[PDB]
């Protein structure tokens, strides 16, 4: 079949839907996947048909988490970003011919779009699952109009300002087990909980970590703006009896940074898959696929969120002790060191980290995603006929 | 297409604007054209529609001794925003325009493309500003705290009033004084642009914007055109300086050519000393024609006076008096293409010794030709239009398909 995929500009949300667009191909779907020009090379590995719409983000990259947000102006970008994309879409497919529609479950402008073609669609979605339970400021005006243009013309039903960004599909295919999912037994059969969406993906020095104890720290590809953390994770893991790989993302220079210790890779992007393989622990923001990645590959977490979502994952981790939460406000060369020290030490997180490891693996992944797709498609195809 | 254009009340405002509007017209934009009545002339030879509002300037002769305080400019500029944004919505309601353009430094501008809910584009006359840059001008004019500025309510309650009343979307005392648009064009190259490297691709660097003025010829050009000519202007704000003017026509009698010397609107030669005969002394001139024929410009260190005379590759002296001028010397003297007097160590004898310096001197002649083409480089008013063209296509294209759409 020919299957129209919308993504979301942020590495977090293209990286699991490479394996699913992988399995797809694999199982005959000819595929279209729109997304912005930054993770096309993501894209065109895969041997699928790459299309651009405009990078509405500029935020999403170099930030500290210390950052001033009005919830209600970044709902207005948002929803004016979905006009535009539908619109854009819309223009290039109408004349073309998809039997469903694949999208990234916080980009509204996919669901916009499914509607627009009335076709089958599938929501993948990169977060915790989320349902009601998980905006009077100098740009709440522009909100409600943009809300009510979308809702008229783009069948957006946007009816809470947290509806915005919850653009369920006819499944919405989750990259977490229920054994992760925070409230999991709120989410009926149409919530297809697959666990992470795990394949290779597209120069690290392995052979200098071959046969090293390992210690990863990562704050990911957005709240990556964080010298004084990366100084203070150089004086807490001098002493470190292996190698630590630090990922500094693509904006701080290493020679910004005080002198790198001898044990250290420091590097502004790694293969974090690879390294995770070989990872004793993984210093996290608790951005959900860093944490995913890390508990699927069975290692113990430290977390430090920065925004969003990762308060609530973060949160999540310490439940089900898979790890231990330091607050950015807490954070000292002593309380790093002693949290680090503590989740290494302490078998229970290396424990608990193996089980929920083996809830994650035992969902299925990007082939659980791509077969509950498809038989949705062929039951739709059926019904029809009916 | 139509073109909605809300000026600056401020010559080096102006200027720049001249050569983008221009480029716009002569690819079949129809422009309106809102400034003070003083900058009418400037407008009206491009054949664009001119419209005035209120003058509400404090950006006049000026020393630059003058304590300015950074709240009460907040509110000044408030209020006017509020006066001006009220007056030009009156007057462009019933009319369709495509796209807004307006002065970086004008809130109003912004208020109004998100009133007609168009796409804008804002034209930045000085260096690019980020919070950064944007604090440290701000600190210039700050006593002690936020708090206990004689403004700081007032500050708040008219920013209320603006975003509640006229959309304006005020966040920090920044969104009032520079006011992003869609793109950002700033007319300097990346080179000369302190902080360069921090600026996105939606500042749009195009170097100076040079083009032919109105009253381009007024001036005895024959009494110039095969002389070495020094040229010394104070700008068209801090020119209230009748005591360095004086310094000028000593310091300068006994130079072998032409001294073309700008006193302003305010000061009359009549009130200077003996003027030699080597001089043309005039209120103004036509600037950049007296820059193509000088050897040696001294400035105030204006971002428009200092971006005029190195796109002419003329080397400068440089005696800042206020606002970004400091920074503005500090780059000049960063690049080497010129000199800088400090105005608390300005005497007649060091004002000499610093003018022989660079006059005639390989060094400053180089490096003022090296960051003059750094700004002939960017593109200028061509690569402004261009880049303005390529947005309102795009806005106008999306705009329309969901038109049809619907
Ligand atoms: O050096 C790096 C840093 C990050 N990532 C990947 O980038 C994604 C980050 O997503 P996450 O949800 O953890 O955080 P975000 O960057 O969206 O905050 C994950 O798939 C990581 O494996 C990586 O491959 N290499
Ligand atoms: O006799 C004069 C004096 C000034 N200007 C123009 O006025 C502007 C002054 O701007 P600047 O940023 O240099 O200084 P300000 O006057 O804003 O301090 C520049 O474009 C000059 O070319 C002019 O044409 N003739």
Redesign the interface.
């Known amino acids: 079949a020919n299957v129209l995929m919308i993504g979301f500009p942020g590495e977090g949300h293209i990286n699991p839907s490479i394996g699913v667009m992988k399995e797809l191909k694999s199982r005959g779907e000819n595929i279209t996947y729109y997304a912005v020009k930054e993770y096309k090379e993501k894209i065109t590995a895969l041997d699928i048909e790459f299309r651009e719409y ?1 990078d509405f983000r ?1 935020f999403g990259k170099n930030a500290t988490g210390d950052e ?1 947000r ?1 919830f209600t ?1 970044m709902l207005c970008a948002f929803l004016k970003a979905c ?2 994309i539908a ?2 879409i ?2 290039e497919v109408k004349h073309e011919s998809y039997d469903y529609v694949i999208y990234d479950h916080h980009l509204l402008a996919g669901k916009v779009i499914a509607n ?1 073609l009335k076709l089958p669609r599938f929501s993948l979605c990169t977060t915790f699952a989320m349902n009601e339970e998980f905006e009077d400021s ?2 709440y ?2 909100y409600q109009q943009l809300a009510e243009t979308l809702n008229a ?1 783009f069948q957006a039903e946007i009816k809470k300002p947290f509806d915005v960004f919850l653009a369920d599909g006819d499944l919405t295919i989750v990259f977490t087990s229920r054994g992760f999912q925070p409230l999991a037994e709120q989410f009926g059969e149409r919530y297809v909980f697959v666990g992470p969406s795990i394949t290779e993906r597209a120069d690290f020095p392995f052979d200098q970590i071959d046969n090293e104890n390992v210690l990863f720290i990562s704050m990911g590809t957005i709240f990556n703006n964080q010298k004084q953390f990366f100084n203070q994770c150089l004086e807490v893991c001098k002493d470190f009896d292996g190698k630590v790989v630090l990922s500094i993302g693509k904006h701080i220079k290493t020679s910004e940074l005080n002198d790198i210790p001898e044990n250290f890779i420091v590097r502004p992007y790694v293969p974090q898959l690879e390294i995770l393989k070989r990872a004793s622990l993984f210093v996290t923001h608790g951005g959900m696929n860093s944490t995913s990645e890390g508990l699927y590959f069975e290692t113990p977490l430290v977390v430090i969120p920065m925004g969003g979502d990762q308060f609530v994952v973060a949160d999540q981790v310490e439940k089900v002790g898979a790890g231990k939460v330091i607050k950015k406000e807490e954070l000292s060369e002593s309380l790093l060191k002693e949290t680090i020290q503590e989740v290494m030490n302490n078998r229970s997180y290396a424990e608990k980290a193996k089980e929920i490891g083996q809830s994650l693996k035992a969902a299925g992944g990007s082939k659980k995603a791509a077969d509950s797709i498809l038989e949705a498609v062929k039951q739709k195809t059926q019904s029809a006929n009916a």
């Open positions: 405009h500029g001033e009005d102006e006009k535009d619109t854009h819309y223009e627009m100098p740009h005006e522009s013309d």
